[PDB]
Design an enzyme around this catalytic site. Structure first.
Site, PDB file in Angstrom:
ATOM      1  N   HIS A   1       0.589  -1.171  -0.106  1.00 22.46           N
ATOM      2  CA  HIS A   1      -0.036  -0.288   0.336  1.00 22.46           C
ATOM      3  C   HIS A   1       1.305   1.495  -0.123  1.00 22.46           C
ATOM      4  O   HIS A   1       0.354   2.210   0.314  1.00 22.46           O
ATOM      5  CB  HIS A   1      -0.839  -0.180   0.621  1.00 22.46           C
ATOM      6  CG  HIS A   1      -0.573   0.464   2.637  1.00 22.46           C
ATOM      7  ND1 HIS A   1      -1.110  -0.834   3.590  1.00 22.46           N
ATOM      8  CD2 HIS A   1       0.279   1.532   3.351  1.00 22.46           C
ATOM      9  CE1 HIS A   1      -0.112  -0.206   4.245  1.00 22.46           C
ATOM     10  NE2 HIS A   1       0.717   0.716   4.631  1.00 22.46           N
TER      11      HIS A   1
ATOM     12  N   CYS B   1       3.542   2.022   9.681  1.00 25.00           N
ATOM     13  CA  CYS B   1       2.990   0.412   8.754  1.00 25.00           C
ATOM     14  C   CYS B   1       5.212   0.752   8.171  1.00 25.00           C
ATOM     15  O   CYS B   1       5.298   1.227   8.015  1.00 25.00           O
ATOM     16  CB  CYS B   1       2.392   0.932   7.598  1.00 25.00           C
ATOM     17  SG  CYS B   1       0.984   0.723   7.914  1.00 25.00           S
TER      18      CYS B   1
ATOM     19  N   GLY C   1       2.543   6.703   9.740  1.00 31.42           N
ATOM     20  CA  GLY C   1       3.916   6.182   8.871  1.00 31.42           C
ATOM     21  C   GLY C   1       4.273   5.002   9.199  1.00 31.42           C
ATOM     22  O   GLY C   1       5.071   5.311   8.830  1.00 31.42           O
TER      23      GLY C   1
HETATM   24  C1  LIG Z   1      -0.666   1.570   7.637  1.00 32.08           C
HETATM   25  C2  LIG Z   1      -0.369   2.852   8.281  1.00 32.08           C
HETATM   26  O1  LIG Z   1       1.139   3.584   8.652  1.00 32.08           O
HETATM   27  N1  LIG Z   1      -0.424   3.958   6.846  1.00 32.08           N
HETATM   28  C3  LIG Z   1      -0.959   5.316   6.711  1.00 32.08           C
HETATM   29  C4  LIG Z   1      -2.211   5.968   6.737  1.00 32.08           C
HETATM   30  C5  LIG Z   1      -2.161   7.365   6.663  1.00 32.08           C
HETATM   31  C6  LIG Z   1      -1.148   7.952   6.280  1.00 32.08           C
HETATM   32  N2  LIG Z   1       0.578   7.295   6.216  1.00 32.08           N
HETATM   33  C7  LIG Z   1       0.391   5.917   6.298  1.00 32.08           C
HETATM   34 CL1  LIG Z   1       2.110   4.960   5.598  1.00 32.08          CL
END
Ligand SMILES: *CC(=O)Nc1cccnc1Cl
Ligand SMILES: *CC(=O)Nc1cccnc1Cl
Lengths: 304, 304
Positions: free
Chosen positions: B41, B145, B143
């Site tokens: 993602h 992830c 951030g």
């Molecule tokens: C899972 C994660 O950290 N996702 C996310 C959400 C919002 C912004 N950036 C990210 Cl990477």
């Protein structure tokens, strides 16, 4: 989202841990630049610990009696001195992994990470607080002494604790990295009892703010209080008096949540008087007091 | 003495964390040998997450679109592929800090350490469990992830988790390092609800043994039970069924304490039926279920 009891990453400290052996006693030392720091009781037999004269015991020790091992490589000891309750072993090699560091003496209520070590090798990392009675509630077996407590500010490790002592109540006592014990404790196997382990009120309130930030709000009530009224209740429950300094420190969390500190005090008052009624806050059934306001802000904003 | 929620030392994993940026999305990657592992993602906008076609989104991405940064040095991407829900970014440099490692897929009830990262930089370390509903109860902001969960056996890091997802209930979902989600979760912003978060019975019993070992004995009672009788009570309280395999695993702790597993089951039965009555065990007011029997033995014997 979510709020965990979180330690600092331990890598910078792992790089500093050595084994120190004097006679039959093995414990841990902290190698920074060309000095290895370790508890002075490294020179004691268990028999010595009943009534040690450290200056007298030290006279019988030479540089070559302090066996210092970093991994599977021996360090050469070129000097040794006692500073309060620590030995400083001068070695001929600067630790190449020495991080930027400070020695800091923390106050009761301040949290820190402990890297638990045995034979100079890391076993694990956990979060502690300097209790108001100047004990810490650690996890320390025989051999764990010389394990250190620390905070990190970006790239600078602030060393605040070295492990020395288990009280018969199974709580822990130790020194700053200048070898001064926290509290009235001494490196002797004697009657030493901890005082009242009071709850760190400002830390509980920080953690209640962390709970609101992370969606746990059931304990928010319609009430407020004053410092003086709250403090009457804190006294009764062996909670530390809340000061205006604590109110000021909680200001950012107040701002972010829009919950006045004194309103959160009134929530904490009801929780003290009424209990949890079998409910949980951030997966805890008691009020957590080992997050500082700074810990909450750090973890809720993702500081690295 | 003392028993803390203890993470593995994080140094070996800290040495593996990089920043991965694709377009406006920044998250963390794990650099082992010449491969950087990250959630797929990384290629999605938030808008894409509602209904992503990853193969179709991936076609628009070249090696030079994956910005990989280790500290303040850029890594050259020479290849990329999707394996399940992870990307493998081939880089031209083997991570010089690559530890000995395995990719392992853990079972529900298994514990692991999480190194929470932002922009490829460690913020903290904490202990998690794979919940019976295949969620984990983490601390993860946007951030975070690509942060990983791991166990260490001496010098070998077993990577078991990569962070991908927060459910609207504020619990966490992720993959093994082959990119297969734990449980039925998917990397799409859709209705996904966790099932029952049942309590890991074998872990609670482990932790009751840890309590006895560390002097907390008030909950030991005069009773015993059978697996079948205990399990009737486990059902009622949303505890996992206790199997003979669990009894066998608890055998060493049984031996060390001299408390038959079924006697400790009868203690846990009374605690479930009667509650704590405002008492604590190892400083907890609820029954802790995120220590495995192996965790208890490790921490109580000081393994490094
Ligand atoms: C899972 C994660 O950290 N996702 C996310 C959400 C919002 C912004 N950036 C990210 Cl990477
Ligand atoms: C504090 C500590 O670890 N002391 C100790 C007790 C028993 C044996 N060896 C040591 Cl070192």
């Amino acid at each position: 989202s979510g709020f965990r009891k979180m330690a600092f990453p331990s890598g910078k400290v792992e790089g500093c841990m050595v084994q120190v052996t004097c006679g039959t006693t093995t414990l841990n030392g902290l190698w920074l630049d060309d000095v290895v720091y370790c508890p002075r009781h490294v020179i004691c037999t268990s028999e010595d610990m009943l009534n040690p004269n450290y200056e007298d015991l030290l006279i019988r020790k030479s540089n070559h009696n302090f066996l210092v091992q970093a991994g599977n490589v021996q360090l050469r000891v070129i000097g040794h001195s006692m500073q309060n309750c620590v030995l400083k072993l001068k070695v001929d090699t600067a630790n190449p992994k020495t991080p930027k560091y400070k020695f800091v003496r923390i106050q009761p209520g301040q949290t820190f990470s402990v890297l638990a070590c045995y034979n100079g090798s890391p076993s694990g990392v956990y979060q502690c607080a300097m209790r108001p009675n100047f004990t810490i509630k650690g996890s320390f077996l025989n051999g764990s002494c010389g394990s250190v407590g620390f905070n990190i500010d970006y790239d600078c490790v602030s060393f605040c604790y070295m492990h020395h002592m288990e009280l018969p109540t199974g709580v822990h006592a130790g020194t700053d990295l200048e070898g001064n014990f926290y509290g009235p404790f001494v490196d002797r196997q004697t009657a030493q009892a901890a005082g009242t382990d009071t709850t760190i009120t400002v830390n509980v309130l920080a953690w209640l703010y962390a709970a609101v930030i992370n969606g746990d709000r059931w304990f928010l009530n319609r009430f407020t209080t004053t410092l003086n009224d709250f403090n009457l209740v804190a006294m009764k429950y062996n909670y530390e008096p809340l000061t205006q300094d604590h109110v000021d420190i909680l200001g950012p969390l107040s701002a972010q949540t829009g919950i006045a500190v004194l309103d959160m005090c009134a929530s904490l008052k009801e929780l003290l008087q009424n209990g949890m009624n079998g409910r949980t806050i951030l997966g805890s059934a008691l009020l957590e007091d080992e997050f500082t306001p700074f810990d909450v802000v750090r973890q809720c904003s993702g500081v690295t």
